[PDB]
Ligand binder design. Structure first.
Ligand SMILES: O=C(O)[C@H]1O[C@@H](O[C@@H]2[C@@H](O)[C@@H](O)OC[C@H]2O)[C@H](O)[C@@H](O[C@H]2OC[C@@H](O)[C@H](O)[C@H]2O)[C@@H]1O
Ligand SMILES: O=C(O)[C@H]1O[C@@H](O[C@@H]2[C@@H](O)[C@@H](O)OC[C@H]2O)[C@H](O)[C@@H](O[C@H]2OC[C@@H](O)[C@H](O)[C@H]2O)[C@@H]1O
Ligand SMILES: O=C(O)[C@H]1O[C@@H](O[C@@H]2[C@@H](O)[C@@H](O)OC[C@H]2O)[C@H](O)[C@@H](O[C@H]2OC[C@@H](O)[C@H](O)[C@H]2O)[C@@H]1O
Ligand SMILES: *[C@@H]1O[C@H](CO)[C@@H](O[C@@H]2O[C@H](CO)[C@@H](O)[C@H](O)[C@H]2NC(C)=O)[C@H](O)[C@H]1NC(C)=O
Ligand SMILES: *[C@@H]1O[C@H](CO)[C@@H](O[C@@H]2O[C@H](CO)[C@@H](O)[C@H](O)[C@H]2NC(C)=O)[C@H](O)[C@H]1NC(C)=O
Ligand SMILES: *[C@@H]1O[C@H](CO)[C@@H](O[C@@H]2O[C@H](CO)[C@@H](O)[C@H](O)[C@H]2NC(C)=O)[C@H](O)[C@H]1NC(C)=O
Ligand SMILES: *[C@@H]1O[C@H](CO)[C@@H](O[C@@H]2O[C@H](CO)[C@@H](O)[C@H](O)[C@H]2NC(C)=O)[C@H](O)[C@H]1NC(C)=O
Ligand SMILES: *[C@@H]1O[C@H](CO)[C@@H](O[C@@H]2O[C@H](CO)[C@@H](O)[C@H](O)[C@H]2NC(C)=O)[C@H](O)[C@H]1NC(C)=O
Ligand SMILES: *[C@@H]1O[C@H](CO)[C@@H](O[C@@H]2O[C@H](CO)[C@@H](O)[C@H](O)[C@H]2NC(C)=O)[C@H](O)[C@H]1NC(C)=O
Ligand SMILES: *[C@@H]1O[C@H](CO)[C@@H](O[C@@H]2O[C@H](CO)[C@@H](O)[C@H](O)[C@H]2NC(C)=O)[C@H](O)[C@H]1NC(C)=O
Ligand SMILES: *[C@@H]1O[C@H](CO)[C@@H](O[C@@H]2O[C@H](CO)[C@@H](O)[C@H](O)[C@H]2NC(C)=O)[C@H](O)[C@H]1NC(C)=O
Ligand SMILES: *[C@@H]1O[C@H](CO)[C@@H](O[C@@H]2O[C@H](CO)[C@@H](O)[C@H](O)[C@H]2NC(C)=O)[C@H](O)[C@H]1NC(C)=O
Ligand SMILES: *[C@@H]1O[C@H](CO)[C@@H](O)[C@H](O)[C@H]1NC(C)=O
Ligand SMILES: *[C@@H]1O[C@H](CO)[C@@H](O)[C@H](O)[C@H]1NC(C)=O
Ligand SMILES: *[C@@H]1O[C@H](CO)[C@@H](O)[C@H](O)[C@H]1NC(C)=O
Ligand SMILES: *[C@@H]1O[C@H](CO)[C@@H](O)[C@H](O)[C@H]1NC(C)=O
Ligand SMILES: *[C@@H]1O[C@H](CO)[C@@H](O)[C@H](O)[C@H]1NC(C)=O
Ligand SMILES: *[C@@H]1O[C@H](CO)[C@@H](O)[C@H](O)[C@H]1NC(C)=O
Ligand SMILES: *[C@@H]1O[C@H](CO)[C@@H](O)[C@H](O)[C@H]1NC(C)=O
Ligand SMILES: *[C@@H]1O[C@H](CO)[C@@H](O)[C@H](O)[C@H]1NC(C)=O
Ligand SMILES: *[C@@H]1O[C@H](CO)[C@@H](O)[C@H](O)[C@H]1NC(C)=O
Ligand SMILES: *[C@@H]1O[C@H](CO)[C@@H](O)[C@H](O)[C@H]1NC(C)=O
Ligand SMILES: *[C@@H]1O[C@H](CO)[C@@H](O)[C@H](O)[C@H]1NC(C)=O
Ligand SMILES: *[C@@H]1O[C@H](CO)[C@@H](O)[C@H](O)[C@H]1NC(C)=O
Ligand SMILES: *[C@@H]1O[C@H](CO)[C@@H](O)[C@H](O)[C@H]1NC(C)=O
Ligand SMILES: *[C@@H]1O[C@H](CO)[C@@H](O)[C@H](O)[C@H]1NC(C)=O
Ligand SMILES: *[C@@H]1O[C@H](CO)[C@@H](O)[C@H](O)[C@H]1NC(C)=O
Lengths: 189, 219, 189, 189, 219, 219
């Protein structure tokens, strides 16, 4: 099967439905909020690693707030829900990339393109590690520009999908027919 | 050209009203030149799936009084799942390889109990489980004797994985019933409390062998 | 993996390609027909329970009509095809919701928004059960309105997708270019 | 989980990002190039067989070029990556179709609609085999026309998605508002 | 601006014809102011994938006369799968732990047969299977002796899971052949009947251990 | 109506410039009638996830000097993973069923090592593994003695499946270290080299029992 876990509501005013990472989650970086789009991106995607991690974060938060810690581990929940939280073969793909000798995902550092003015973010993706060191930002600069273009395309697409969802086709149809018939009237004039 | 139905449902959005206004202006200009009800029509009609229609391919789970759970396979055979203080079995055996030697049992029931036993999270105490298979009868008893981290916890977990019918906290569950009984029975309509459903067994098939402990290096 | 089973053709005049549930399937409710859209909705979705059930229904129907009942069960087919019919971790998600103490799926009752005039339906989704009883319709009224809005958006989107599939971009392009060039001609006039 | 393997860059001038099959791959048919669209089609699809095969092809190519053959088999890679390369239950679906008695996928011959003038291809799909022989092209002619229509719709849709990705909504909006306000000005005139 | 190719393919739909008409009207007004062939061009060109190109990573299945099935791993070793009335083995053993003790065999072949034996649906009779591994040779024989619900049913099922080459009904299959033989062999082109393919083994990997019976509580 | 932000990002495409030109023409006509910076604003801000926040539910893997690997479960217990030439264990036993008989150990650690041992690809030599469980302590040693196709290959494979910290080719890996040690320890911050992460164990859970050899027909 695939993952089925859903993200708990997050108490972020700017981002109502998107998992916001608190001070404790991010090392020496205070609190950052991502938004509903970035976290909901991988409700169909099986090839992203960071949103699986934040699903792990939300599962931990649920297990703490709505159960009792008891000071001893309950591996039952994680062993049962691991296939419901994360993809099962993405780690296999990164293990294979590692064996072959191409840069693989670290799973500790993740990089994202924070939009300075508006504060949107791409869904963070793994910082490739190779040869026992971090890849220079120059090495995968091409991937950085590809992700920037992906952000642009995805935000310009989601608004289209929202417009399609709210606006029926009978409107844009009867609009183009009416404008065409008025253009015909101008032709007659 | 079915805009009429949609228009009543959602005229609130500004873009729709702007579009309609522009269309009406263009049309006028060209002619001059020439119980549970939601929204307005949507209704909360509900379904009660008769799952007896799946009696020929899938086992169905339903219960009678929150203590007598059942699994029916076909229209001829089923099993009791009774939470009780009384033990029908007083020997700590499970003669599985003897059952396989004398293939006189029903394959469906043995697969049911195999799935049930391979889905018990972190099962490590084999003293609890007891079995009887003489004549093809399926009998399995469990001792729910116990702080948490006990085989009773996981065994109740897999019970409510299967039956889905049911003071414990932090993923630990306790019941006053000391024992549980699984045993062969015929088919009737004796599960007033719960509708029959197959989802318990299909879901239990997912987690089988997932949380099992290693007892040998080679396996 | 994921499910791969496909729905057999259903003998419903109103709904040619959509699984129609007969009298026997629905308790004391005669026969209802859903349509191709509702049943085909979860050809990409992994988070719906009722269409997995109707896939089970169609698998049973195929096994009865195109094999022999023989009066003894053949668990082989269901044990082999269970991962090809239903999602494997959705039941895990509902078990987890049950353990935590939030309302979980019953898997017996399913509710849907029957459009009275046209007869369309949303894909039925599980009636949440909690605290040993059915949730009041008031409790999840918000989810009901969310599903109504989802029906509206999905029907207003599918027609857009059909228009995109049948109408090429060279048409809407050469149309907007021609209208713009005529507007330029009016500017010259 | 699902597949996560990604297709290695292919040295085809016509098709930069699409897996091109060389002379050795295709029996007595020289070299053919498919394109990025056909190979990328099943990055969300779980019901296609041929692109799983070409993922197997690319995995073999990677294992040969970037490891050492050593003349003895390394089943470790394939046993680890099989769930990352192919769907796990599509073969189950074809086994079931075989048991029931409907035509099943052969997995040797695949048919596709080569566009003669432009050279595009649909993603090849399995040639159904039944009754111990290949089905006549007349028998599944209906499926052939359905796939032709699917090619037409998918190519007319992808260009729409590309236009949506590159063109923002603020443009088409301010365009329709400006044209409407000019039509209003013509009404005043 | 590649409308020319699409226009021939699908001009039937009313919306397209309306669009073209409107465009032609606008253009005229502005100028005044100033073998197997489908549709028309699509062809049923077919592919015959040479699966020998996967000889270096994947085992390929192909058969010769509908009774001699084969699995080739690499370009040096393969296995016979023969449905016959003759038994090469007359002892009911499978010395698997002895084979693992003396690691003188080919790992690919042992993994092949392990997958084959872990995909046998509801296997419960161990008397049928017989094995020989002396010297690294892979030999496995099966007794297909038998109404249904027999190990022969599931063993033929997993055969056609693997080979995909082949009067039984209701998910029960019977063959006149009493026995089946799996044994080591070299590589040739001796499978005229069937093209080599890996899909049988990859699919068999899916169902391994899925339909297995429990023989011990701890496992 | 947030076109302003997008316009700076991507004005290169011809269609956008054409649209803007047409809009400006229409507006003019109607008025007459009346560190690491990408693109211009996107920045490569990075995240360093403090995975200690998952100490209450998930085991975290981190290492100190590329030879001392660690797995910490909770904030009280963890395990050493040391590649060394020194053996703490000189007996070829693994008393797993004795450990299950006396349930005095931590369930998390036993599940960790069970997952570790069920993910070893094509494990066939049981002489290598040695275990100590007296008192609830978790001790597992591995002999990495060896051409390839050796248990050392797969055992290093599963090591770097778990720890992800590390001249061998063609999916064969060799190390000068003869032995490896897993043993119980308390919790500190002694893994300067590597950040703690759970991904090794979650990924190892995927491949458990996948590449296992059959040692019995019934299983
Ligand atoms: O644990 C294992 O997987 C193997 O352990 C070997 O040694 C045993 C110890 O584990 C311990 O239980 O004390 C008894 C020892 O025998 C077993 O020898 C081995 O059994 C296989 O080899 C012997 C053969 O007779 C059996 O049929 C095999 O199962 C365990 O696999
Ligand atoms: O079935 C099981 O999983 C355990 O059963 C225990 O009792 C046995 C009975 O099942 C029955 O077979 O009659 C013989 C009994 O021994 C086993 O003792 C237990 O074996 C483990 O503990 C003993 C040890 O010597 C073995 O190495 C373990 O496998 C079964 O797990
Ligand atoms: O390999 C198997 O699955 C069964 O093999 C049967 O025969 C054994 C041979 O495999 C070989 O190891 O030499 C010893 C033989 O016993 C076993 O008898 C059978 O064990 C079951 O039935 C006997 C019972 O005492 C055990 O508890 C069962 O495990 C193997 O399943
Ligand atoms: C089990 O389900 C089957 C069909 O799913 C039921 O079979 C039908 O039973 C009715 C009883 O009046 C007959 O009229 C039909 O002819 C039967 N149809 C088929 C296809 O068998 C069966 O009744 C169910 N079992 C029970 C005990 O009710
Ligand atoms: C079920 O478990 C309970 C407790 O684990 C068993 O009760 C024990 O029985 C033994 C022997 O009869 C006594 O020595 C203990 O003192 C009992 N303990 C308790 C807490 O009652 C009970 O016997 C088990 N059931 C069966 C059928 O063996
Ligand atoms: C399960 O197998 C054991 C194997 O020992 C059976 O125990 C034997 O049962 C017979 C039946 O009367 C007795 O004669 C023997 O003395 C028993 N052996 C021992 C060592 O106690 C056990 O009976 C089987 N289970 C069932 C329910 O029959
Ligand atoms: C197994 O496949 C490999 C490649 O997939 C074949 O190797 C090629 O064989 C031809 C034979 O004429 C040589 O010219 C090439 O140089 C080989 N290439 C590589 C990369 O090895 C091999 O021939 C196949 N096995 C058999 C028996 O045909
Ligand atoms: C394969 O199975 C058949 C039947 O299951 C075995 O034939 C039996 O052999 C025994 C002893 O030789 C006889 O007592 C039975 O009467 C036979 N039954 C039948 C139906 O022929 C056959 O021996 C098995 N093959 C092997 C190699 O043991
Ligand atoms: C599989 O293992 C069994 C273990 O008993 C082997 O049986 C022994 O084989 C040797 C070989 O000559 C004989 O000397 C013994 O007398 C046999 N023991 C018994 C109890 O019969 C068996 O031979 C092995 N299988 C193969 C193919 O060698
Ligand atoms: C393990 O993680 C938990 C929370 O994820 C940490 O618990 C917090 O510890 C700080 C220490 O200053 C306290 O102020 C908080 O009140 C604790 N919160 C909770 C919810 O327990 C814990 O410190 C971590 N373990 C270690 C050893 O640092
Ligand atoms: C780990 O493996 C090595 C080699 O596999 C073992 O070393 C062998 O030990 C035996 C008995 O002490 C000698 O007869 C061999 O000559 C040794 N071989 C080599 C290559 O050194 C070593 O004993 C094993 N470790 C343990 C603890 O048993
Ligand atoms: C694992 O189990 C074996 C079972 O034989 C233990 O071996 C016995 O250990 C006791 C402990 O002193 C000795 O008295 C026996 O003589 C041993 N038996 C044999 C045949 O050697 C072994 O000790 C256990 N492992 C550990 C670490 O205790
Ligand atoms: C992005 O940058 C702004 C300041 O320019 C900051 O306030 C915000 O927290 C950043 N977002 C993230 C996710 O770091
Ligand atoms: C990365 O850049 C640093 C300097 O910034 C340089 O010393 C190092 O060699 C570079 N690494 C690679 C792999 O090019
Ligand atoms: C069970 O169903 C089958 C198939 O409809 C039928 O032939 C048989 O009589 C039923 N059994 C009973 C006890 O009604
Ligand atoms: C079973 O025993 C428990 C405790 O001994 C007690 O609640 C009662 O006697 C029995 N349970 C019920 C529900 O009657
Ligand atoms: C679903 O609701 C019905 C209402 O009577 C109940 O009988 C049944 O037990 C419920 N399902 C489950 C799995 O509890
Ligand atoms: C919806 O209601 C109509 C009558 O208003 C009825 O004919 C139809 O069967 C209903 N659909 C379903 C699925 O119940
Ligand atoms: C549901 O509504 C009924 C009355 O319609 C009321 O008695 C009951 O308490 C309500 N349940 C909850 C959980 O509010
Ligand atoms: C399609 O046909 C053209 C010639 O009409 C040929 O050049 C091309 O290779 C064909 N494509 C494929 C994939 O076979
Ligand atoms: C397929 O066509 C051939 C002739 O082209 C004919 O002989 C054969 O019977 C046909 N097969 C079927 C199943 O109709
Ligand atoms: C098998 O293929 C390898 C790699 O191409 C080659 O070196 C070897 O000679 C082949 N074996 C035979 C028997 O041709
Ligand atoms: C094998 O035996 C069967 C029945 O005894 C019989 O068909 C024949 O002798 C053999 N089978 C074949 C296909 O020759
Ligand atoms: C596919 O068709 C070819 C045609 O000759 C045949 O040889 C082969 O056996 C078929 N594939 C399968 C799996 O039967
Ligand atoms: C571990 O965490 C728990 C929960 O925050 C806390 O109560 C306990 O004191 C911690 N243990 C240590 C040794 O700090
Ligand atoms: C372990 O032994 C090897 C070979 O005997 C040798 O490199 C050294 O003595 C030890 N390894 C290290 C890294 O010191
Ligand atoms: C990720 O990078 C950090 C950088 O210091 C390193 O410590 C850590 O080991 C890396 N992760 C893995 C899994 O190697």
């Amino acid at each position: 099967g695939t993952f089925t876990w859903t993200l708990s509501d997050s108490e972020g005013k700017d981002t109502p439905g998107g998992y916001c990472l608190t001070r404790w989650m991010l090392i020496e970086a205070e609190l950052k909020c991502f938004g509903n789009t970035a976290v909901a991106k991988c409700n169909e995607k099986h090839d992203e690693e960071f949103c699986d991690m934040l699903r792990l974060f939300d599962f931990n938060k649920q297990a703490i707030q709505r159960l009792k810690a008891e000071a001893q581990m309950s591996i039952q929940l994680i062993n049962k829900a691991v296939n419901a939280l994360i993809n099962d073969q993405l780690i296999m793909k990164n293990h294979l990339r590692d064996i072959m000798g191409i840069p693989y995902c670290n799973y500790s550092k993740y990089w994202y393109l924070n939009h300075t003015t508006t504060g949107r973010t791409s869904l963070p993706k793994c910082w490739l590690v190779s040869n026992g060191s971090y890849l220079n930002e120059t090495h995968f600069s091409d991937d950085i520009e590809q992700q920037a273009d992906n952000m642009i395309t995805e935000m310009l697409q989601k608004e289209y999908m929202e417009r399609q969802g709210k606006t029926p086709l009978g409107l844009v149809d009867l609009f183009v027919f009416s404008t065409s018939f008025y253009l015909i009237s101008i032709f007659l004039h | 050209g079915q805009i009429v139905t949609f228009f009543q449902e959602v005229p609130h959005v500004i873009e729709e009203v702007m579009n309609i206004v522009l269309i009406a202006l263009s049309v006028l200009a060209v002619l001059k030149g020439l119980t549970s009800l939601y929204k307005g029509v949507y209704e909360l009609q509900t379904l009660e799936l008769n799952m007896e229609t799946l009696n020929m391919t899938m086992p169905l789970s339903c219960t009678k009084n929150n203590s007598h759970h059942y699994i029916m396979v076909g229209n001829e055979t089923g099993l009791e799942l009774t939470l009780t203080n009384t033990s029908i079995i007083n020997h700590k055996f499970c003669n599985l390889s003897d059952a396989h030697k004398k293939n006189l049992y029903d394959h469906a029931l043995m697969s049911i109990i195999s799935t049930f036993h391979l889905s018990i999270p972190n099962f490590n105490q084999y003293e609890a489980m007891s079995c009887d298979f003489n004549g093809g009868k399926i009998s399995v008893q469990y001792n729910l004797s116990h702080h948490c981290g006990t085989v009773a916890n996981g065994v109740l977990q897999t019970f409510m994985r299967m039956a889905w019918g049911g003071r414990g906290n932090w993923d630990c569950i306790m019941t006053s019933y000391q024992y549980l009984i699984i045993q062969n029975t015929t088919w009737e309509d004796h599960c007033q409390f719960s509708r029959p459903s197959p989802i318990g067994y299909l879901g239990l098939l997912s987690q089988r062998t997932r949380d099992i402990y290693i007892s040998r290096r080679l396996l």
